[PDB]
Design a protein around this ligand. Sequence first.
Ligand SMILES: *[C@@H]1O[C@H](CO)[C@@H](O)[C@H](O)[C@H]1O[C@@H]1O[C@@H](C)[C@H](O)[C@@H](O)[C@H]1O
Ligand SMILES: *[C@@H]1O[C@H](CO)[C@@H](O)[C@H](O)[C@H]1O[C@@H]1O[C@@H](C)[C@H](O)[C@@H](O)[C@H]1O
Ligand SMILES: *[C@@H]1O[C@H](CO)[C@@H](O)[C@H](O)[C@H]1O[C@@H]1O[C@@H](C)[C@H](O)[C@@H](O)[C@H]1O
Ligand SMILES: *[C@@H]1O[C@H](CO)[C@@H](O)[C@H](O)[C@H]1O[C@@H]1O[C@@H](C)[C@H](O)[C@@H](O)[C@H]1O
Ligand code: ERE
Ligand code: ERE
Ligand code: ERE
Ligand code: ERE
Ligand code: CL
Ligand code: CL
Ligand code: CL
Ligand code: CL
Lengths: 7, 7, 7, 7
Amino acid sequence: XXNXXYX
Amino acid sequence: XXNXXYX
Amino acid sequence: XXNXXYX
Amino acid sequence: XXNXXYX
Ligand SMILES: *[C@@H]1O[C@H](CO)[C@@H](O)[C@H](O)[C@H]1O[C@@H]1O[C@@H](C)[C@H](O)[C@@H](O)[C@H]1O
Ligand SMILES: *[C@@H]1O[C@H](CO)[C@@H](O)[C@H](O)[C@H]1O[C@@H]1O[C@@H](C)[C@H](O)[C@@H](O)[C@H]1O
Ligand SMILES: *[C@@H]1O[C@H](CO)[C@@H](O)[C@H](O)[C@H]1O[C@@H]1O[C@@H](C)[C@H](O)[C@@H](O)[C@H]1O
Ligand SMILES: *[C@@H]1O[C@H](CO)[C@@H](O)[C@H](O)[C@H]1O[C@@H]1O[C@@H](C)[C@H](O)[C@@H](O)[C@H]1O
Ligand SMILES: *[C@H]1C[C@](C)(N)[C@@H](O)[C@H](C)O1
Ligand SMILES: *[C@H]1C[C@](C)(N)[C@@H](O)[C@H](C)O1
Ligand SMILES: *[C@H]1C[C@](C)(N)[C@@H](O)[C@H](C)O1
Ligand SMILES: *[C@H]1C[C@](C)(N)[C@@H](O)[C@H](C)O1
Ligand SMILES: [Cl-]
Ligand SMILES: [Cl-]
Ligand SMILES: [Cl-]
Ligand SMILES: [Cl-]
């Protein structure tokens, strides 16, 4: 919720 | 991106 | 109780 | 989300 990714 | 929060 | 998650 | 509180 505010960071990015992608996982 | 797939976890939650809130920050 | 006021934060989020998910655990 | 699974803990309690109260905050
Ligand atoms: C996750 O939180 C953001 C930021 O507030 C919100 O815009 C999204 O709609 C929210 O996603 C929902 O809630 C999560 C907990 C559910 O897993 C997701 O499927 C979506 O309903
Ligand atoms: C972030 O990534 C998700 C895919 O997991 C995608 O659904 C969103 O549209 C994407 O957010 C955009 O790109 C990020 C980099 C920007 O900060 C956000 O404002 C939105 O434009
Ligand atoms: C969690 O909170 C976000 C941001 O406020 C909201 O967009 C989501 O819908 C909310 O998730 C719901 O409520 C929580 C309590 C549940 O664990 C989740 O699965 C979803 O129903
Ligand atoms: C909080 O959790 C305890 C232990 O399970 C339960 O006995 C209480 O009913 C529960 O409180 C409710 O749910 C929480 C989320 C609300 O903040 C509280 O006001 C009460 O409705
Ligand atoms: C973001 C980019 C990635 C790491 N290559 C991909 O595997 C993931 C699903 O999305
Ligand atoms: C999620 C709930 C929170 C941690 N209490 C709030 O400060 C944040 C902006 O959103
Ligand atoms: C919230 C999202 C998560 C961390 N990917 C999931 O494992 C948990 C049960 O809910
Ligand atoms: C839960 C109980 C508490 C710590 N006394 C209160 O201050 C909070 C608002 O709710
Ligand atoms: Cl994120
Ligand atoms: Cl996330
Ligand atoms: Cl919480
Ligand atoms: Cl909780």
